[PDB]
Amino acid sequence: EKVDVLVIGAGPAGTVAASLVNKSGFKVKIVEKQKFPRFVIGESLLPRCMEHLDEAGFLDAVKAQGFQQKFGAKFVRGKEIADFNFSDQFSNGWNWTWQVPRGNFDKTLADEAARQGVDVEYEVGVTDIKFFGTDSVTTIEDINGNKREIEARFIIDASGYGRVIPRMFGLDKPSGFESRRTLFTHIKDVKRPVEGNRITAVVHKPKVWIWVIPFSNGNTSVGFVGEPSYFDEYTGTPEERMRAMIANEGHIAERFKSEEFLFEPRTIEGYAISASKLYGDGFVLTGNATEFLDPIFSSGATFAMESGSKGGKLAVQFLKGEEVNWEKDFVEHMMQGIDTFRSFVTGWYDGTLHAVFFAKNPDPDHKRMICSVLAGYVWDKNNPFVKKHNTILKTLAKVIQMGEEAL
């Protein structure tokens, strides 16, 4: 009923945010609305998150789980292949990370946090927040419908898709990206190749792509993402449709034909969304309670940990009575990273990026710089592709074509 920081959500955002707060002696609580383990989408991590996993002391717990290691991202268009190796990049920093079922991953983290001294309470869903200056009174509901209040010096809203605070005080801002649909499931990957240390993204149609994410449990997450009109071209049950879409892609058709699905395929549409501000008196937003761009380059959970870390470190500065420039130490920081992936998303969809990816004799320096963007090092200002992100793709692609005509 009385705490320094109330963390809403036991996802990677709130677990990382919580650990860092606890690490500095304060009293911090996570209320998690679901029972863990609990399914959520967003399974392919980036090397950059290893930084926060390391700082929060989660690395050992995660390693013990034996998740599938990830050494890069592979892009397929027909038979054209562009393999990015995280071991060859412009930036210093981590060169490898994990593909993880989020149920098990997010429980590993939460459970480590609790152990660390964080008190984690499950099956208790926020329902109302009332602010008095920077102090707050939060009401939770347990599984039995009974309500109780929590008093805090600060709320870190790590509610992800719940968008707890953004919805309570109307902080939702349309994204700018146009609506897209997704269909996905896990597949028992009996016919998996003997490679494996990659996420693979498949250029299926002009504006449709697919993700193939290998886990260490025998299964493989597969998801179609793209233009909604495309999905309407298939008729039938989620499973029928899903098996139909796979059958229409040469790169995976035979591999997944007839293989078992761990669960009926799920849809997510209009997943792009932003916030009018990322913080206010008594709170900061994190992860998906901030802004989600697009799944292409698998960054969501890394942004959630990055923002959870930053908001965590900053909320400690607040509690200590230090001056905090949220605009500069938080917002500007999240947007630098978020604006970088934005440019690469746009370029994924507008044709420019593909031209770079599938250029014959791609420059190996450009490749490296691009590779550090894919690894999450989108704060490295020395990396021209970070420096010039809203320009370089369109610019590079023109230069490529100029090269094509010459010959």
Ligand SMILES: Cc1cc2nc3c(=O)[nH]c(=O)nc-3n(C[C@H](O)[C@H](O)[C@H](O)COP(=O)(O)OP(=O)(O)OC[C@H]3O[C@@H](n4cnc5c(N)ncnc54)[C@H](O)[C@@H]3O)c2cc1C
């Ligand atoms: C199709 C698709 C594919 C994606 N692929 C990837 C990917 O390969 N890699 C990647 O990094 N990201 C991916 N993402 C993004 C990703 O899913 C998120 O970035 C990630 O889950 C966000 O972490 P989070 O901690 O911010 O929120 P969440 O992971 O959603 O967790 C928030 C927690 O808050 C809890 N909660 C919600 N409401 C309340 C409440 N009222 N009270 C208490 N608790 C509450 C929830 O139960 C939840 O546990 C993908 C997204 C989509 C749509």
